[PDB]
Amino acid sequence: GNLRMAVMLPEGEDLNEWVAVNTVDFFNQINMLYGTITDFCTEESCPVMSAGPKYEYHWADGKKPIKCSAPKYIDYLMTWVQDQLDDETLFPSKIGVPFPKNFMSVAKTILKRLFRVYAHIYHQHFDPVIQLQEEAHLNTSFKHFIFFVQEFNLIDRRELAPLQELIEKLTS
Amino acid sequence: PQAFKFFMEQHVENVLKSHQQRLHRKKQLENEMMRVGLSQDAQDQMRKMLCQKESNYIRLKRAK
Ligand SMILES: [Zn+2]
Structure with a gap:
């Protein structure tokens, strides 16, 4: 099916609410997604959190970077986003x-880091992903994610670098 | 293993069905509104009430 129509904002619907719901959904999807591949990112497979050799990801953002392995980065990311969703404020x-007047900020942030999960998975663990029939579901989840993000421009395009390989390919 | 696959399989149908369901909610509402001859004020009023109903529903769905 097509999601361009679905991901759009309905009449009278508050943007922040829509974004919140979809973000929660994609968060769950990604959570289960890594939950199926958690045995493979073993910190010997991914010593540093990176979307491939070129595209590397650090937790904090500079003066200078700090050491960040993938399982730590992701385990945290899950715990963090969970804490954010549980934050009633x-x-x-x-x-x-x-909603707080600073909602869209952490919205864009969360979605960005979720994309970073999508990236580590798509790149580093593409091979063990196929070891079980799962690439289609991943493609679907990521497709919905990207349709949404694009439709509301919630992540800087410069961030969506390490997955364009399929991005424009997927939105045929 | 299976959980992610099942959820993802049913998810597209799920959200699309949600979309069409909301569309039909609105259309049904204004269909009943066309007959029985309400004034524009009531129309806008209950329109806002519908939007609020939907927003409430999705907010409630989000948590537990
Ligand atoms: Zn890994």
Whole structure:
């Protein structure tokens, strides 16, 4: 099916809410996704969190970088995003409570790091991904993710570098 | 192993069905609104109420 129509913002629907829901969804998807490949990123397979040799990812962002392996980066990333979603001052659960005025910031941040997970998986563990019939599901999840991101421009294009190999290919 | 696969298999149908369901909610609402002759004010009012209903629903769906 097509998601260009679906990922769009409906009439009267608050943007931050839409973004929140979709972000949570993609978060769950990615969580299970790595949950199936957690036995393969063993820190000997991925000594440094990187979307391939060229594209390398550090946790914090500079003066200068700090050592960041992949399983640490990802385990954290999960715990972190979970904490963010559980933060009632960012992701309210009661209808009377409005979003903070800085929501879209951490939205873009979270989605960016989720994409970084997508990247480490697509590049470093492409081979063991096929060891079980799973590439289609990954392609679907990532497709929805990218359609959404593009439709609302939630990640800088300069960040989407290490996966363009399929990006424009997938949106035929 | 299976969980991610099952979820991803059912997810597209899920969200698409959600989309069409919302569309049909709105269309049904305005279909009933066309008959029985309400004024523009009530139209806009209950429109806002519908949007709020939907936003509420997705917010509630998000957590537990
Ligand atoms: Zn790994």
